[PDB]
Amino acid sequence: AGTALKRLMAEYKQLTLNPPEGIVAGPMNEENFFEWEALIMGPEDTCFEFGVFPAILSFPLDYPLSPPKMRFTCEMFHPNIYPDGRVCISILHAPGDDPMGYESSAERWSPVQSVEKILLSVVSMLAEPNDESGANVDASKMWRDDREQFYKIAKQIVQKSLGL
């Protein structure tokens, strides 16, 4: 097995052994460890509380040297999530001379990170709509100019994810 396969099996074992609260993640099929499905719950007492949000994680051949791609498959409305579902946060951006508008030498991906860490960071991102990427310009603007409406939309996003 290549380095990538080794690391990914190792990470998954730790996840199955000690399941993280509010986060479920693993390969859709163990014949291909490079494609995972993840489910994360919006943290209690935040505007996305109890939403259940599915995402696909696609890992590069050179993992963990490069980060996975992560895309939500459900409807979302958040400053750091593109209209297509792609999650844009500094920790998922490969170190490189192209800020892609993140931050002052924003914290990039490193092999120190892990799937558990990416997912916990995304959970935090939901709880703390931290406009670092302006991925959804409309959500960015509303978070800034009409917070109370943003909260309204967020509960709708929750209800939709629950199928209610």
Binding site: P19, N29, L39, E49, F50
Partner: peptide, 28 residues
Amino acid sequence: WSADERQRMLVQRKDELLQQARKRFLNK
């Protein structure tokens, strides 16, 4: 565990996550 065991547990954790979230949302 086997892969089959792991895959089944995963599907189960996912169903249960959604069921408990729904309960907490409706309970609130």
